[PDB]
Structure formats: C-alpha cells, structure tokens
Model the fold of this input.
Amino acid sequence: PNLFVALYDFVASGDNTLSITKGEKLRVLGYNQTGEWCEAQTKNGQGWVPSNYITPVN
Amino acid sequence: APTYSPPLPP
Done:
C-alpha cells in the first residue's frame, strides 16, 4: 500500500528534498503537518517531495 | 519537511 508513482519530474530544492522523475516508482513513509510534503524513498535515496506529485500504483 | 510550500503541479 506504500507503492507510488511520480506524476511529474521534481528537481530537489535542497532542505532534504528528493529529486524524482515522472513515471518512476517510490515508497512513501509519511507526510508533514499540512500534508503538502511527502517523505519518500526511491533507488536514489530518501527525502521530501510534493504530495500531489505522486500517486498510488498497484 | 521544508518550512516553505512545495511548487504547485504544472
């Protein structure tokens, strides 16, 4: 239930954010207080990405 | 998480 796919490329902006590429899979650890940011893991590492830049995949 | 909001979706 934690497997997601990226909707859009996102280039890290520092501050423990994680670059992700459209169509690539990621596993979600959780969210920040407002829900706007999502802490995720990919083959490239771990960090924060926008919550509405990702979606579940079976 | 960052204290600033993320970028909006394209």
Observations:
- The two ends of chain A are 8 Å apart (CA to CA).
- The longest strand of chain A covers residues 25-31.
